[PDB]
Coordinates of C-alpha atoms and ligand atoms in Angstrom, one line a residue:
X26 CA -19.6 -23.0 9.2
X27 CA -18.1 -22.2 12.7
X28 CA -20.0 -23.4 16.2
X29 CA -21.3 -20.3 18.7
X30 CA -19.6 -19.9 22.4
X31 CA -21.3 -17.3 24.9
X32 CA -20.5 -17.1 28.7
X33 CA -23.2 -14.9 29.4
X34 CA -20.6 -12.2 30.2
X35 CA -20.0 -10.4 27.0
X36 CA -16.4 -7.8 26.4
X37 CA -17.8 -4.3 25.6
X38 CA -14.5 -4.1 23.5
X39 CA -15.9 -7.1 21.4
X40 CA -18.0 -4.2 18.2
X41 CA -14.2 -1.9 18.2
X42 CA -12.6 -6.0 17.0
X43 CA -15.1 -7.0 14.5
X44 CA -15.4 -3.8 13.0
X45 CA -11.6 -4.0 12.6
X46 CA -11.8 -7.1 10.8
X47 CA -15.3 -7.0 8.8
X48 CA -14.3 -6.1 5.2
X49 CA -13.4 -8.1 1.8
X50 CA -10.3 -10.2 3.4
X51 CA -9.6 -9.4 -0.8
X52 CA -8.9 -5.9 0.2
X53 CA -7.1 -7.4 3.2
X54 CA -5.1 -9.4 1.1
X55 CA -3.5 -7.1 -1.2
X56 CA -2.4 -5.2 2.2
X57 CA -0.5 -7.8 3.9
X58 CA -0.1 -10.6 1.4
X59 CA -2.0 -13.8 0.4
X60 CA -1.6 -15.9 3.2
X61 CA -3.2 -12.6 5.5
X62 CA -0.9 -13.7 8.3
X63 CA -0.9 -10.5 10.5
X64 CA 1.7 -10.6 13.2
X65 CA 4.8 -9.1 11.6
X66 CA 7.6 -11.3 10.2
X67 CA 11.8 -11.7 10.4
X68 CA 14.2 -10.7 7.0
X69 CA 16.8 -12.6 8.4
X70 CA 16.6 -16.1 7.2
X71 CA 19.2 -17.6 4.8
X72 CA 16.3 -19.1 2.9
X73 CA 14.4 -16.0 1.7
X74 CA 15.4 -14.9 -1.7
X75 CA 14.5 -11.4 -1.4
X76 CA 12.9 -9.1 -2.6
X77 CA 11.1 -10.9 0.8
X78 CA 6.9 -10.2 1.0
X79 CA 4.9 -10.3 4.6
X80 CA 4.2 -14.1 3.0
X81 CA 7.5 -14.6 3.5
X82 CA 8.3 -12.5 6.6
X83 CA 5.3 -13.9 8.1
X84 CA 6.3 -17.8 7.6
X85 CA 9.7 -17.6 8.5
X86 CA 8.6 -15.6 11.8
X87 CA 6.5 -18.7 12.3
X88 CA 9.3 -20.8 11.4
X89 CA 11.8 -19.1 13.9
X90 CA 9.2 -19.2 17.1
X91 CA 8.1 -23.2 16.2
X92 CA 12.2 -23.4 16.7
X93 CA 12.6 -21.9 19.8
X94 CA 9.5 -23.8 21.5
X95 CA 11.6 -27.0 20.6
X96 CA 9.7 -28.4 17.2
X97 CA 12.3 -28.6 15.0
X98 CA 10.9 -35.4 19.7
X99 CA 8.3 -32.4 20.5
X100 CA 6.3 -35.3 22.9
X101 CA 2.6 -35.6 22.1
X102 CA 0.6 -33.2 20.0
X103 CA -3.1 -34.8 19.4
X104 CA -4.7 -30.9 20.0
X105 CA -4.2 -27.9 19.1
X106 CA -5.9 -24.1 19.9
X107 CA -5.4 -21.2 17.9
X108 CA -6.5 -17.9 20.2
X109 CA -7.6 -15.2 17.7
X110 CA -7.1 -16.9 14.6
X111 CA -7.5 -14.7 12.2
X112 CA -8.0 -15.6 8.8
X113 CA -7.1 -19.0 9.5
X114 CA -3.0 -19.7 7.9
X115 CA -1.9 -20.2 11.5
X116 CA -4.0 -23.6 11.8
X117 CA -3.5 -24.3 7.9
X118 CA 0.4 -24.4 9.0
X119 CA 0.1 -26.2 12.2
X120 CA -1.9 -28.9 10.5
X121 CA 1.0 -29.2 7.8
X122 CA 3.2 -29.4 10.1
X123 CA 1.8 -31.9 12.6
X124 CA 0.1 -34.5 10.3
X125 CA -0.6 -37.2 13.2
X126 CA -2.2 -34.1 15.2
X127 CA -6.4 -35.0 14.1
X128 CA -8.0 -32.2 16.3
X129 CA -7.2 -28.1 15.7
X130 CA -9.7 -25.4 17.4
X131 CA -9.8 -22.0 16.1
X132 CA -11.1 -19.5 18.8
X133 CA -12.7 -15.6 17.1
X134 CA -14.7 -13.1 17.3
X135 CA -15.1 -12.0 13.9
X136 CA -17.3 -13.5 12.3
X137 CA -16.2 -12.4 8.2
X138 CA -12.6 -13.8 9.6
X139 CA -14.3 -17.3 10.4
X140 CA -16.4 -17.1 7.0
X141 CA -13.5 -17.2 4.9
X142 CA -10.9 -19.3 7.3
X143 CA -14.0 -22.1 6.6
X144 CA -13.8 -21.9 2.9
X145 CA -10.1 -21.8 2.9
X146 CA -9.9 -25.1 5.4
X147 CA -12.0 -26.3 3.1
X148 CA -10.2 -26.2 -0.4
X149 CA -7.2 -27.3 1.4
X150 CA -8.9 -30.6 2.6
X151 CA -8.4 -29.8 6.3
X152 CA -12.5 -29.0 7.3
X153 CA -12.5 -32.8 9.0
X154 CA -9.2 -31.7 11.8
X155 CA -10.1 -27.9 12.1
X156 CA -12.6 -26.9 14.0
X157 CA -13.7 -22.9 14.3
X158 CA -15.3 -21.2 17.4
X159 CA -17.3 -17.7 17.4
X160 CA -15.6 -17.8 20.8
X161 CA -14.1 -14.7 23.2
X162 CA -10.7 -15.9 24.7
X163 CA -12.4 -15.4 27.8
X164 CA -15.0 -18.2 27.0
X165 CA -12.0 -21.2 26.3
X166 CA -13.1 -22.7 29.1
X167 CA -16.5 -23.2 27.3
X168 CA -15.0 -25.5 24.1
X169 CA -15.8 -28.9 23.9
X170 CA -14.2 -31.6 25.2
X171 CA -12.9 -30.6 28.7
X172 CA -11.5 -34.3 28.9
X173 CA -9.2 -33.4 26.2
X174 CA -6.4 -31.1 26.9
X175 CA -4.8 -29.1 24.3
X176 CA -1.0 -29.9 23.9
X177 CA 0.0 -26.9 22.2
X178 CA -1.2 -23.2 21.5
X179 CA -0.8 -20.0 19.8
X180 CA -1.4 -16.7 20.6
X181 CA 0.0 -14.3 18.4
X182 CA -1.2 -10.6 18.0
X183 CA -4.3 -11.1 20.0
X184 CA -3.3 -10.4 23.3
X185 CA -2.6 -6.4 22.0
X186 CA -6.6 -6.1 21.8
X187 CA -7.2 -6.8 25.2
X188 CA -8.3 -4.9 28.2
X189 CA -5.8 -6.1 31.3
X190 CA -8.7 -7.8 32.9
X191 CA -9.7 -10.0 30.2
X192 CA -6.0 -10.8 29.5
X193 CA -5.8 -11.6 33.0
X194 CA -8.9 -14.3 32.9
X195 CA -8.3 -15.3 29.6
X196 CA -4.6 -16.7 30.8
X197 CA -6.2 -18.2 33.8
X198 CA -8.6 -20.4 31.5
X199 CA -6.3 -20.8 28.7
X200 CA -3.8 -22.8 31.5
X201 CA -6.6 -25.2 32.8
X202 CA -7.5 -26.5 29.5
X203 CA -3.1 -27.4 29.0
X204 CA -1.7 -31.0 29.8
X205 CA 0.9 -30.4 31.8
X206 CA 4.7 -29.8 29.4
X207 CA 2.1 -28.3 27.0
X208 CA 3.3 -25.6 25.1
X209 CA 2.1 -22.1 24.2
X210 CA 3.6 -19.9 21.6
X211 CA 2.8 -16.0 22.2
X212 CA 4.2 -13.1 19.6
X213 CA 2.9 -9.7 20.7
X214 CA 3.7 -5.6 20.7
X215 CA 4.9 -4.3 24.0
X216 CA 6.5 -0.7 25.4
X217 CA 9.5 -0.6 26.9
X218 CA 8.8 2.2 28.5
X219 CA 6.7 3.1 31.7
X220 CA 3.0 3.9 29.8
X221 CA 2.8 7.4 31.7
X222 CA 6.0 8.5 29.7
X223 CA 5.2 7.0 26.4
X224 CA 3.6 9.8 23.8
X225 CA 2.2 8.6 20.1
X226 CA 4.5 9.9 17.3
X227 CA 1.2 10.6 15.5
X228 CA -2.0 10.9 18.1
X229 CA -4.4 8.2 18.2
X230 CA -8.2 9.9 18.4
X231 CA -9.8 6.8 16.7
X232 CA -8.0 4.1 18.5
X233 CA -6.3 2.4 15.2
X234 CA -7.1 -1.4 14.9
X235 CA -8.2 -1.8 18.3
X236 CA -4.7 -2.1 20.4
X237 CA -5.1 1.0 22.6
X238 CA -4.5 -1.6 25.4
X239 CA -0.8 -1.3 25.5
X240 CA 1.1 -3.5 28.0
X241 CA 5.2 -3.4 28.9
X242 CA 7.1 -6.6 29.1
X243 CA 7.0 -6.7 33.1
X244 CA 3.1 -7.0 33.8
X245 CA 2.9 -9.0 30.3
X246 CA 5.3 -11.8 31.6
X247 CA 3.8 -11.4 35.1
X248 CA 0.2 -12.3 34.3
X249 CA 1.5 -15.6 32.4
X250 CA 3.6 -16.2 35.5
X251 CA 0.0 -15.6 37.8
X252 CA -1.7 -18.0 36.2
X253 CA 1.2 -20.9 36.6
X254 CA 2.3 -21.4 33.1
X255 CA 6.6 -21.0 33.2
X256 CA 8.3 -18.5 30.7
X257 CA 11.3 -21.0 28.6
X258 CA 12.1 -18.0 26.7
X259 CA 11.3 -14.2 26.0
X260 CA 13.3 -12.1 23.6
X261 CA 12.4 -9.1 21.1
X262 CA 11.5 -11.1 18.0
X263 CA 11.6 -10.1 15.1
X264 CA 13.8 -7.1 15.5
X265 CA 12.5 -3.5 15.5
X266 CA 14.1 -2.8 11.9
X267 CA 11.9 -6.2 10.7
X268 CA 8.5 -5.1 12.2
X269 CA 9.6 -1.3 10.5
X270 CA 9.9 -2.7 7.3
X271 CA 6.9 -5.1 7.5
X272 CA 4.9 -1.8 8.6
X273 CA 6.2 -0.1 5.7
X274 CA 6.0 -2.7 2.8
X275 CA 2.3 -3.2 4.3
X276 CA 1.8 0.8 3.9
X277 CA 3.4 0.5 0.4
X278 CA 1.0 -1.9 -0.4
X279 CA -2.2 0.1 0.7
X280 CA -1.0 2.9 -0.9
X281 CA -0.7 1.4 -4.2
X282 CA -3.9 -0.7 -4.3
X283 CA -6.0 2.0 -2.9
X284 CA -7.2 5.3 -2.8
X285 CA -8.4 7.8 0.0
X286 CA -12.4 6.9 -2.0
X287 CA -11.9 2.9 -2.1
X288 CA -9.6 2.0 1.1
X289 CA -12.1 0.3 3.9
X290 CA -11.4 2.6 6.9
X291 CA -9.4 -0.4 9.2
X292 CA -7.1 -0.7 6.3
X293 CA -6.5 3.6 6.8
X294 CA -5.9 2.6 10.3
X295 CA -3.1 0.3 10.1
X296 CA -1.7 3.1 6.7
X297 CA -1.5 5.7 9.6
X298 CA -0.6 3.4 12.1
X299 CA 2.7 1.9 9.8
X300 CA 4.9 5.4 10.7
X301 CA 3.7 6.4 13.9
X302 CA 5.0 2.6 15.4
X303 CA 7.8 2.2 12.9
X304 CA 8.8 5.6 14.3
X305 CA 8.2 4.3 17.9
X306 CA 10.2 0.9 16.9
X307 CA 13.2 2.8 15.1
X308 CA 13.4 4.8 18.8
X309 CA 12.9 1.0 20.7
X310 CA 9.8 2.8 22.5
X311 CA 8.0 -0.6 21.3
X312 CA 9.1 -3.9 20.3
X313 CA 7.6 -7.3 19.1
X314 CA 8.5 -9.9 21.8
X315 CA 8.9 -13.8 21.1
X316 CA 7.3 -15.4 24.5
X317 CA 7.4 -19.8 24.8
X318 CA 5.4 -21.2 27.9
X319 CA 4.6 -23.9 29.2
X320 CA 2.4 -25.8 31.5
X321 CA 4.4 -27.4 34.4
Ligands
SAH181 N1 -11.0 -11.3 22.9 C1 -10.8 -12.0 21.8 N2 -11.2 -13.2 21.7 C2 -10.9 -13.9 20.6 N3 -10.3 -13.5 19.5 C3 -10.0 -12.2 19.6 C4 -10.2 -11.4 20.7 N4 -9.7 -10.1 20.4 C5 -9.2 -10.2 19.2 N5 -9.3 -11.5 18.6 C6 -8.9 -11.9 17.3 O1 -7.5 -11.8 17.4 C7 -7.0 -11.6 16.0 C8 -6.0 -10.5 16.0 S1 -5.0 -10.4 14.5 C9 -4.0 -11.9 14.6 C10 -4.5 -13.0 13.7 C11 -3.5 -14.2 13.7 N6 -3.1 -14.6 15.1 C12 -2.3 -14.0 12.8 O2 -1.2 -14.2 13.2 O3 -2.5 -13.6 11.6 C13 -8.2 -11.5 15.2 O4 -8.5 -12.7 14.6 C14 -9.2 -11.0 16.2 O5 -10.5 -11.0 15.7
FPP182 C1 -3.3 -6.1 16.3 C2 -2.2 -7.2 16.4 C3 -1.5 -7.2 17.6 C4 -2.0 -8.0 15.4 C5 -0.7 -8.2 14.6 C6 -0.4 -7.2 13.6 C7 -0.3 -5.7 14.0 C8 -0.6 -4.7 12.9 C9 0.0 -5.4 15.2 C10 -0.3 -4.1 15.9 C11 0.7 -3.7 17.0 C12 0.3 -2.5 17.8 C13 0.0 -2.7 19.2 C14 0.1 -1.3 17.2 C15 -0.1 0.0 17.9 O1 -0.1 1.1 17.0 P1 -0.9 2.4 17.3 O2 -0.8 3.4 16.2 O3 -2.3 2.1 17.8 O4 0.0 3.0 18.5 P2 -0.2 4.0 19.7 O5 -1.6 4.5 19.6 O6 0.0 3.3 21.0 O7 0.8 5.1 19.5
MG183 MG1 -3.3 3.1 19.5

């Protein structure tokens, strides 16, 4: 069960997002592993015994961004958001990892994503401290509880499917609902070059998993910077050669659970997608960047 959020001022861009994320998350899990995390992952920690999975990529990416926002005396943590939560690992970890945190709101738009993050809160025991919202990140100022400020949130590989202008309102929202010295932990897929210069490897006609919004780090930073939140740190994280090989252990995966007949068409996408940006990442035309902010 998940509650409903509308602000009377739907995104046209909302159908291109849920179709994206409709089918089996089965299917979905045999593409990018069992924990569906979907936001890349780092090769470089001394604690993966390889031959290293996207379950392990993806945790240790987690891992490496919870150490750089300073939670490896973090001050209080009593609520939590997760901004396009997907299929619902990110507020399964955060909820591991802060125990004495009782409140964690999940914030999507795809409704087969908040099916199964429900039943998977649920046979982990954590349905009583997670709460999940059919909610736009446009709409946060709509969740319960306005008395209640959220002390730390994440937003990672959500930003990539939005238009500038709901970015732009979203951020402005997001940042009146944060205590002040609240924290929010952003991963997401920028070009480092000027857009008018930039040229897909392999042309983009179908607009592959909904991320034809591109944005470079400059306006990215600036826009968190416009609506008063303060940039700690920003680095390209994880490296281009670690989001290449996540991209091509995912396309491995695809290609050997599936067949041009069976695959769902988003899960094409992301096959065709996984060398035209691991192309674009091995020429650092595109990286994945690390941003921690905070509320002053
Ligand atoms: N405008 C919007 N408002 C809310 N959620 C959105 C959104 N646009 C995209 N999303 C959600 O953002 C997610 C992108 S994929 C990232 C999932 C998750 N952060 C992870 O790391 O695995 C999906 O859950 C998608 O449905
Ligand atoms: C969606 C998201 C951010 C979630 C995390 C996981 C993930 C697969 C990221 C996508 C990154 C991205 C912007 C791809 C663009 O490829 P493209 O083939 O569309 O590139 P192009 O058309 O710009 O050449
Ligand atoms: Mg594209």
């Amino acid at each position: 069960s998940y509650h409903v959020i509308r602000g009377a001022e739907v995104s046209g861009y909302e159908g291109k997002v849920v179709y994206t994320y409709q089918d089996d998350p089965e299917d979905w899990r045999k593409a990018i592993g069992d924990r569906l995390m979907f936001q890349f992952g780092v090769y470089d920690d001394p604690r993966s015994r390889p031959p290293i999975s996207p379950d392990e990529s993806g945790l240790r990416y987690f891992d490496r961004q919870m150490e750089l926002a300073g939670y490896g005396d973090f001050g209080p943590v009593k609520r939590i958001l997760d901004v396009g939560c997907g299929w619902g690992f990110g507020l399964k970890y955060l909820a591991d990892r802060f125990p004495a945190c009782p409140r964690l709101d999940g914030i999507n738009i795809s409704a087969r994503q908040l099916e199964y993050c429900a039943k998977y809160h649920a046979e982990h025991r954590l349905s009583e401290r997670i709460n999940l919202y059919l909610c736009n990140a446009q709409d946060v100022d709509l969740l319960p509880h306005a008395d209640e400020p959220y002390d730390l949130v994440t937003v990672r590989g959500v930003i990539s499917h939005f238009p500038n202008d709901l970015y732009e309102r979203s951020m402005a929202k997001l940042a009146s609902r944060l205590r002040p010295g609240a924290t929010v932990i952003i991963s997401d897929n920028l070009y480092n070059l000027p857009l008018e210069q930039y040229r897909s490897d392999t042309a983009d006609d179908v607009d592959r998993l909904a991320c034809k919004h591109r944005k470079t780090p400059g306006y990215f930073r600036q826009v968190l910077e416009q609506c008063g939140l303060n940039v700690e740190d920003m680095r390209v994280l994880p490296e281009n050669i670690d989001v290449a090989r996540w991209f091509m252990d995912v396309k491995k995966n695809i290609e050997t659970h599936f067949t041009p007949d069976t695959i769902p068409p988003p899960l094409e996408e992301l096959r065709v997608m996984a060398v035209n940006v691991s192309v674009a990442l091995i020429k650092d035309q595109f990286s994945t960047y690390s941003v921690i902010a905070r509320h002053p």
